[PDB]
Tab-separated table of N, CA and C in Angstrom:
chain	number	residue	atom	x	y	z
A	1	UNK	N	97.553	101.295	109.471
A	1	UNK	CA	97.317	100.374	110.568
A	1	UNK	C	95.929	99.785	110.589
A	2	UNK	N	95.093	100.271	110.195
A	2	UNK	CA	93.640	99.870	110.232
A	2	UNK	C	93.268	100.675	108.697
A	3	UNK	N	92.570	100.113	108.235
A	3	UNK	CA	91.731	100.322	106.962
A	3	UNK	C	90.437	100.163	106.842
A	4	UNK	N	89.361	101.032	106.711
A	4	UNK	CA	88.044	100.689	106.638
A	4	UNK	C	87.314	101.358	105.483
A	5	UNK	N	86.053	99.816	105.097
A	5	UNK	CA	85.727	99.991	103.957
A	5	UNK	C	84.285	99.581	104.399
A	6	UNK	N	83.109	100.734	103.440
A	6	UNK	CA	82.207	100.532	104.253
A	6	UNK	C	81.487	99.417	103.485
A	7	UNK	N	80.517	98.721	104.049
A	7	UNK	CA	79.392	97.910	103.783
A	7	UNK	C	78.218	98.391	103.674
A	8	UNK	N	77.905	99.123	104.707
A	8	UNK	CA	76.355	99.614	104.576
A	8	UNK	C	76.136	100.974	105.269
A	9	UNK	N	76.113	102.026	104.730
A	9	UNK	CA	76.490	103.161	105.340
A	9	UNK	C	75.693	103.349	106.443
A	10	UNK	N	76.307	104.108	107.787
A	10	UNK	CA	75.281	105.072	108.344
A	10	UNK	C	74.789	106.350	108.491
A	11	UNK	N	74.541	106.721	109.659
A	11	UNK	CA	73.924	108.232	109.237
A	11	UNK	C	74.721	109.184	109.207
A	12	UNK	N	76.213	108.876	108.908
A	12	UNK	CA	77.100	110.006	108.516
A	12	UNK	C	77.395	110.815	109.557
A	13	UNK	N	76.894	111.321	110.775
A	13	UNK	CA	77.130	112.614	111.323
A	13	UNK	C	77.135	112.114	112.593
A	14	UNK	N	76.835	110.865	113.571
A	14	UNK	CA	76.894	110.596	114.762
A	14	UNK	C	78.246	109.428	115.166
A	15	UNK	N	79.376	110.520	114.944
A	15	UNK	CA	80.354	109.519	115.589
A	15	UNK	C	80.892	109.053	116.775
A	16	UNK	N	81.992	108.389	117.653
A	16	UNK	CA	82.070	108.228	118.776
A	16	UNK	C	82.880	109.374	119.244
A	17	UNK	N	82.569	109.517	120.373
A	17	UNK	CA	83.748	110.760	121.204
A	17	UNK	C	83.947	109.509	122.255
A	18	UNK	N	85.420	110.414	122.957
A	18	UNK	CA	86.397	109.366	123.718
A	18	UNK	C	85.680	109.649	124.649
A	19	UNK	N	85.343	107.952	125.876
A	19	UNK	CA	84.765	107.872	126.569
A	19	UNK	C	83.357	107.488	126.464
A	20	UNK	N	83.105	107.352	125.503
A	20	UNK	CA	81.614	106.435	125.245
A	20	UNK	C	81.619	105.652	124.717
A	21	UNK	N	80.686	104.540	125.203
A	21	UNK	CA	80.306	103.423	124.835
A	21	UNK	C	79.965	102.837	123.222
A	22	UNK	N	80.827	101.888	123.008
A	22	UNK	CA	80.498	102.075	121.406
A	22	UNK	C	79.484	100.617	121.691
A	23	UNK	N	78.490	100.489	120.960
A	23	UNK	CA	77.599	98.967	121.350
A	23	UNK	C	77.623	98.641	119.543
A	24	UNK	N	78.517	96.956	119.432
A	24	UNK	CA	78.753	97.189	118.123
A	24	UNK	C	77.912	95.272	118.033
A	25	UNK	N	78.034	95.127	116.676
A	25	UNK	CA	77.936	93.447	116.381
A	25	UNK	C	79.161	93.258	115.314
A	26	UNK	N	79.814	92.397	115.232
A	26	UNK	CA	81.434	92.284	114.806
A	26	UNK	C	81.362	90.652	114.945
A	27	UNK	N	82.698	90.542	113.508
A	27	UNK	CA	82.983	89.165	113.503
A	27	UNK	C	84.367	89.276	113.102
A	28	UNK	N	85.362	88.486	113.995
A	28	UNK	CA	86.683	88.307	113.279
A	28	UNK	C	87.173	87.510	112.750
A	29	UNK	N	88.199	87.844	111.948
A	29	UNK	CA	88.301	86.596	110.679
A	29	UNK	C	90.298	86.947	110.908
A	30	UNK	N	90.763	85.815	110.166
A	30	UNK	CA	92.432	85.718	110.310
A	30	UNK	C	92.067	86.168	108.505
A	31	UNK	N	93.279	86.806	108.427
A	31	UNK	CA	93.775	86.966	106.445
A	31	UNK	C	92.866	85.924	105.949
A	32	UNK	N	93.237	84.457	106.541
A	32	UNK	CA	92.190	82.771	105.418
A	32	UNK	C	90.550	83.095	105.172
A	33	UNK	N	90.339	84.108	105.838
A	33	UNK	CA	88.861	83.948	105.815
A	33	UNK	C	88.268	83.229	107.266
A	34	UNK	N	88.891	82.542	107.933
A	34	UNK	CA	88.367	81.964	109.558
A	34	UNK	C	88.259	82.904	110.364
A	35	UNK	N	86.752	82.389	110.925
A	35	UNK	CA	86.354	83.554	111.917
A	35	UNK	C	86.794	82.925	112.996
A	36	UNK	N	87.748	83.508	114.128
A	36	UNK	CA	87.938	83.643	115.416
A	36	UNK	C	86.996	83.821	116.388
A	37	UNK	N	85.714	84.914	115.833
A	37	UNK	CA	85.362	85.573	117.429
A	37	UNK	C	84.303	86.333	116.544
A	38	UNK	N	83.207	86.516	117.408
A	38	UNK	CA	82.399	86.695	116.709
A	38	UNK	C	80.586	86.867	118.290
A	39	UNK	N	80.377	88.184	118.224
A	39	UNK	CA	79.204	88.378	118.611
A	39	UNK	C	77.763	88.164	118.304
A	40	UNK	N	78.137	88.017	116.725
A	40	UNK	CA	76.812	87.446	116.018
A	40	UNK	C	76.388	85.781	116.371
A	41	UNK	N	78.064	85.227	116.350
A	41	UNK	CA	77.721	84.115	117.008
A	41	UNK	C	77.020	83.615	118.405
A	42	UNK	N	77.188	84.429	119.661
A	42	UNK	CA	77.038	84.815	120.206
A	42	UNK	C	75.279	85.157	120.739
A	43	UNK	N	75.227	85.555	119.500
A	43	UNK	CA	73.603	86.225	119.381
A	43	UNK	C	73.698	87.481	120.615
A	44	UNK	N	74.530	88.663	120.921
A	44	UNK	CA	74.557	89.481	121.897
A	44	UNK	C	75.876	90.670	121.418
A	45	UNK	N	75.062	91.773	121.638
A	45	UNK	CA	76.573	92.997	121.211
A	45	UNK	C	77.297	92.989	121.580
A	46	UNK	N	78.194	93.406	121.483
A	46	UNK	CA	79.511	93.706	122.237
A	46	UNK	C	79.922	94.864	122.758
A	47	UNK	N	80.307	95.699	123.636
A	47	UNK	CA	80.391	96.999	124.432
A	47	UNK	C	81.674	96.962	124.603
A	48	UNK	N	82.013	98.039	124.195
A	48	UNK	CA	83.608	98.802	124.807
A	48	UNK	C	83.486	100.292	124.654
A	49	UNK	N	84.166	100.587	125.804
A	49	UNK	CA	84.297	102.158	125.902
A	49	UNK	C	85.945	102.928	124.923
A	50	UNK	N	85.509	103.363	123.837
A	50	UNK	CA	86.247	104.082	123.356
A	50	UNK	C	87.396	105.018	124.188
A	51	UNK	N	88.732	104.593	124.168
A	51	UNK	CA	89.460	105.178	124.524
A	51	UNK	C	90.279	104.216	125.879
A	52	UNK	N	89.374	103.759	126.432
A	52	UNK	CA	89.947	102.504	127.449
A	52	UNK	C	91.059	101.886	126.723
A	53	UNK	N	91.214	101.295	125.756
A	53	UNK	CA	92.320	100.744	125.245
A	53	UNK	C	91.780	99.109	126.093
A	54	UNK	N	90.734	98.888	126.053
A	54	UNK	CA	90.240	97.528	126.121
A	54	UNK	C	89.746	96.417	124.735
A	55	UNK	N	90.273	97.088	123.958
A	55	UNK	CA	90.295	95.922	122.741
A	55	UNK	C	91.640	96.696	121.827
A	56	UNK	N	91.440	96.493	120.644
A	56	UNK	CA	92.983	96.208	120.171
A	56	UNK	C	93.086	97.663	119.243
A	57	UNK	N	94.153	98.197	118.946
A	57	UNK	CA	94.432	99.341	118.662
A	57	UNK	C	93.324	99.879	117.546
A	58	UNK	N	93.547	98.898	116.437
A	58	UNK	CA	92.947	99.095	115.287
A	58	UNK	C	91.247	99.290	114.968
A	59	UNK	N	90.349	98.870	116.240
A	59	UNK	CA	89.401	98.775	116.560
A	59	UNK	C	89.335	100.142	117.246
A	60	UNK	N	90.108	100.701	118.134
A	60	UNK	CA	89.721	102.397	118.395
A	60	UNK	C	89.931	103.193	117.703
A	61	UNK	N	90.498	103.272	116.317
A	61	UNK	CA	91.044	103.826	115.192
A	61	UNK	C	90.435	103.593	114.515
A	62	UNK	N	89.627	102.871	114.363
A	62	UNK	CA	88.406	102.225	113.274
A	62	UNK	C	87.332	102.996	113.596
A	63	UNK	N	86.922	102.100	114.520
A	63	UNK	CA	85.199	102.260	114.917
A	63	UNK	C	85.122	103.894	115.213
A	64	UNK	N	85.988	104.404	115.797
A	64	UNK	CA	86.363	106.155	115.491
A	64	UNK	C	85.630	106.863	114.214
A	65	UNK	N	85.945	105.735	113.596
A	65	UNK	CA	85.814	106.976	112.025
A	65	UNK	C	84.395	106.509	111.190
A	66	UNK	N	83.519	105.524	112.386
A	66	UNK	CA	82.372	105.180	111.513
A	66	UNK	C	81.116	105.723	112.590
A	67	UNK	N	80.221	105.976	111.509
A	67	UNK	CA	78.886	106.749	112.404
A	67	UNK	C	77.404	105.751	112.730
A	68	UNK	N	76.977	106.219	113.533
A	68	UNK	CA	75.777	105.324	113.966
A	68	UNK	C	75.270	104.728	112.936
A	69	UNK	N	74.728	103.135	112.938
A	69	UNK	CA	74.032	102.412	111.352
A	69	UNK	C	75.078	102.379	110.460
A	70	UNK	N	76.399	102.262	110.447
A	70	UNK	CA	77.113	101.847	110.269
A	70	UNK	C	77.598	100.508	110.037
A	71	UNK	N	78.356	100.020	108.640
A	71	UNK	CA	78.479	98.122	108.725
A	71	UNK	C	79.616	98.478	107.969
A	72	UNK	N	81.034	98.386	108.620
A	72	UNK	CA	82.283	98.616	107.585
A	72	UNK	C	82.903	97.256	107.658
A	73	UNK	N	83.876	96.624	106.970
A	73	UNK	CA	85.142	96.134	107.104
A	73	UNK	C	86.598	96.654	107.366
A	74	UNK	N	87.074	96.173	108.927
A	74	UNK	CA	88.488	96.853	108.914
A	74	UNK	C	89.296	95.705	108.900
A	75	UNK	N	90.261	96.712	108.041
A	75	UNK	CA	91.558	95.280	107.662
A	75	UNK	C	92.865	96.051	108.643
A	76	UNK	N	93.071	95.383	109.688
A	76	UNK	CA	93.848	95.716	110.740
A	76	UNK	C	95.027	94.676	110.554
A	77	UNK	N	96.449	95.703	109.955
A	77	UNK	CA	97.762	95.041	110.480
A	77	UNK	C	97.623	94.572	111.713
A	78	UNK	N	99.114	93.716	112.187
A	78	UNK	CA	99.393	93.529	113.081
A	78	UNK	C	99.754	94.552	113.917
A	79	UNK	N	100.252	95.356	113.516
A	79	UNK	CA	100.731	96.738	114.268
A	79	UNK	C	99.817	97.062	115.263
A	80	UNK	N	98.592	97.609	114.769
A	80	UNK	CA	97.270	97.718	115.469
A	80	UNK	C	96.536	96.265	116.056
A	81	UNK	N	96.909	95.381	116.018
A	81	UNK	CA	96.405	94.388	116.582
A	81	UNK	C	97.037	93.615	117.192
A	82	UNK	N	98.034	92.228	116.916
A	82	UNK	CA	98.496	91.511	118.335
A	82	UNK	C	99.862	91.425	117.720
A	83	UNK	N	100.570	91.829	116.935
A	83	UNK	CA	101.495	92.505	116.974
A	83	UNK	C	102.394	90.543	116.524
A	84	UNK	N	103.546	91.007	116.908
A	84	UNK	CA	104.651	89.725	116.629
A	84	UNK	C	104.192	89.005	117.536
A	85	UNK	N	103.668	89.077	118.746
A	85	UNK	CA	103.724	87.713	119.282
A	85	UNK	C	101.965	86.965	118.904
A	86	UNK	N	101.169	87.541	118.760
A	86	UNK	CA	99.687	87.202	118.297
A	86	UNK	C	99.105	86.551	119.716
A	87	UNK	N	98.121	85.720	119.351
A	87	UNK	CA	97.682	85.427	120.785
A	87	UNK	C	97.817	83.837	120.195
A	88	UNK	N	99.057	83.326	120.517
A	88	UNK	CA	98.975	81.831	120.256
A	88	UNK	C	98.311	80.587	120.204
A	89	UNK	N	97.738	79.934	119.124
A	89	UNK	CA	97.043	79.046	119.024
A	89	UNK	C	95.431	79.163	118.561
A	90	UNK	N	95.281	80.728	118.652
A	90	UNK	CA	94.169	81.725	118.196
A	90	UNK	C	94.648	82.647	116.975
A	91	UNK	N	95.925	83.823	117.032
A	91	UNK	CA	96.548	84.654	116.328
A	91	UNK	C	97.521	84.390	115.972
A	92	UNK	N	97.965	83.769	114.440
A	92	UNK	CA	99.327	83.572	114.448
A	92	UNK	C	100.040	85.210	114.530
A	93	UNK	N	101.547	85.112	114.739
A	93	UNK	CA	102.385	86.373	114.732
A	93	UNK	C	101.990	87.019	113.568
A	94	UNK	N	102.327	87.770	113.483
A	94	UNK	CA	102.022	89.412	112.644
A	94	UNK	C	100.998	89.033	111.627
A	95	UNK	N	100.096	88.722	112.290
A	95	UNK	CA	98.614	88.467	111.427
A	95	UNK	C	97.964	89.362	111.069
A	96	UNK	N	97.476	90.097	109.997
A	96	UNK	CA	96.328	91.150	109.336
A	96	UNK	C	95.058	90.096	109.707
A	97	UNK	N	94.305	90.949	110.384
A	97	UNK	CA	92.682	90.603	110.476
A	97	UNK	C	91.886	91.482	109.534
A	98	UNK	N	91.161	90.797	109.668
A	98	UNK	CA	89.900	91.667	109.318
A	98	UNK	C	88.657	91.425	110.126
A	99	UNK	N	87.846	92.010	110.427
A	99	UNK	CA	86.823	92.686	111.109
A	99	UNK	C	85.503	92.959	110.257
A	100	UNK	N	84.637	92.374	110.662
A	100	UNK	CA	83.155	93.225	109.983
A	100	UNK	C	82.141	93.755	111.334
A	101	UNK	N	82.113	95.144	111.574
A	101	UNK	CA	81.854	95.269	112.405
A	101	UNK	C	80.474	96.217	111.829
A	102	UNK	N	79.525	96.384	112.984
A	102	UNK	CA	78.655	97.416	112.873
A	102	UNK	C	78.372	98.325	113.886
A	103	UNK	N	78.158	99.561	113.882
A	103	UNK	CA	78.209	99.969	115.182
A	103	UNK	C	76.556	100.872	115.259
A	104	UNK	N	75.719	99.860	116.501
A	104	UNK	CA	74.501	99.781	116.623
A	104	UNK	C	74.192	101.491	117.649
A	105	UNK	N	74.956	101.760	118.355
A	105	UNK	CA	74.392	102.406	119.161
A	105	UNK	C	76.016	103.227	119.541
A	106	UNK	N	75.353	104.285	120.663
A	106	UNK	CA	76.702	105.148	121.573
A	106	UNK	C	75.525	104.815	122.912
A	107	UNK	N	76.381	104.784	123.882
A	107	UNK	CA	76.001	104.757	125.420
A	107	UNK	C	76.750	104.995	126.199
């Protein structure tokens, strides 16, 4: 459902536990290579609390398994992400994303 491959390792040993704040910088892209969404664009992190189930499956299953200073790529089925119906006109149906995310901090 999610696949991650790292970019730039971090410090190996500080991962998220459920209920804390993951503070990440992330860019999303469709299978073509087009970025959707994107915090870098942005110029500002992005915050979600691990375990809320406030962003998309594959992203709490991901960012889970990467440690502080961290820069992976996750390649998230649809399963874990917007599934058959996608978010129309943004996600086509059963779209694989991918993700380059980093995860800056826990709070």
């Amino acid at each position: 459902g999610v696949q991650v491959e790292t970019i730039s390792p971090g410090d190996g040993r500080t991962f998220p536990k459920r209920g804390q704040t993951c503070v990440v910088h992330y860019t999303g892209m469709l299978e073509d290579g087009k970025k959707f969404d994107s915090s870098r664009d942005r110029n500002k992190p992005f915050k979600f609390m691990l375990g809320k189930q406030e962003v998309i499956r594959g992203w709490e299953e991901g960012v889970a398994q990467m440690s502080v200073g961290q820069r992976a790529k996750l390649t998230i089925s649809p399963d874990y992400a917007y599934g058959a119906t996608g978010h129309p006109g943004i996600i086509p149906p059963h779209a694989t994303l991918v993700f380059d995310v980093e995860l800056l901090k826990l709070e």
